[PDB]
Design an enzyme around this catalytic site. Structure first.
Site: not given
Ligand code: KJK
Length: 267
Positions: A46, A145
């Site tokens: 992200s 993805e």
């Molecule tokens: B992402 O890369 O960034 C993101 C973060 C962050 O920026 O650290 C936190 C929460 C969600 C997201 C969205 C993007 N990533 C995902 O969609 C996958 C992400 C990884 C696993 C999950 N962890 C939460 C508790 N284990 C949340 C989804």
């Protein structure tokens, strides 16, 4: 041998957790830099959402878009991890609010909507980065993805150095004019997800703007930041991590420690 000593420290740290750590840091007041695996590729996760926000602000600046235009999506099937966009699905959001949710909450729906409608997709995001002089960044896929973080996969990667140089250009440089830049800095400062990463490596009273990434596979996670120390020019820090096994969990503590070491290296 300041740089030599810090390299050995990151090397031990990456070995301790059976992973890989990439760092680049800049003191904008002295010009001192420190890099470890700074030209190697790591998944963005992200973290690119921070640059997506900057790209939106640049469109507003070119008058291609209005920061307060309403963006409606009442019928959309929203992506997993869309906490802000889900709340406003009924009413819609201004573009500006949608862009800062993508950054500040890592909102996936905000991200994909903006890429679909305003930025020309991953290819358009990549074009924006090329336009500011960043030749490493590549976004290849859409949410979600792009988070697969497969060992050896070059899709959806950059280098710790390119990320740092780009945040420098955007947060502190002249890609955005002084008004637009001020908004962008305020968006970074308001980020909600980075309390245990770069922010944990500096004094609570320092002012920090950052954007995190968490792929949720292969222990892969990251953070970049602009840091304003009290009475000192800003620092830029870029920390990227991967780990060896698919099931490995990311390490916030490792990211924070790498930041601490990088900050010491340039001081
Ligand atoms: B992402 O890369 O960034 C993101 C973060 C962050 O920026 O650290 C936190 C929460 C969600 C997201 C969205 C993007 N990533 C995902 O969609 C996958 C992400 C990884 C696993 C999950 N962890 C939460 C508790 N284990 C949340 C989804």
């Amino acid at each position: 041998n300041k740089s030599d000593a810090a390299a050995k420290q990151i090397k031990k740290l990456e070995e301790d957790f059976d992973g890989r750590i990439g760092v680049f840091a800049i003191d904008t007041g002295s010009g001192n830099t420190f890099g470890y695996r700074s030209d190697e590729r790591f998944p963005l996760c992200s973290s690119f959402k921070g640059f997506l926000a900057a790209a939106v602000l640049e469109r507003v600046q070119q008058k291609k878009l209005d920061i307060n235009q309403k963006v409606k999506y009442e019928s959309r099937d929203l992506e997993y991890h869309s906490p802000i966009t889900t709340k406003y699905k009924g009413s819609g959001m201004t573009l500006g609010d949608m862009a800062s949710a993508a950054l500040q909450y890592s909102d996936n729906g905000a991200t994909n909507i903006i890429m679909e409608r305003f930025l020309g997709g991953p290819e358009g995001m990549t074009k924006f980065m090329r336009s500011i002089g960043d030749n490493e960044f590549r976004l290849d896929r859409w949410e979600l993805e792009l988070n697969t973080a497969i060992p050896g996969d070059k899709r959806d990667t950059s280098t710790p150095k390119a990320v740092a140089n780009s945040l420098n250009k955007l947060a502190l440089g002249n890609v955005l004019n002084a008004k637009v830049k001020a908004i962008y800095q305020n968006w970074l400062k308001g980020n909600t997800t980075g309390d245990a990463r770069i922010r944990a490596s500096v004094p609570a009273d320092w002012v920090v703007g950052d954007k995190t990434g968490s792929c949720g596979a292969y222990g892969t996670a990251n953070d970049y930041a602009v840091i304003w120390p009290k009475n000192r020019a800003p620092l830029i820090v870029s920390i990227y991590t991967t780990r060896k096994s698919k099931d490995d969990k990311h390490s916030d503590k490792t990211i924070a420690e790498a930041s601490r070491i990088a900050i010491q290296a340039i001081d």
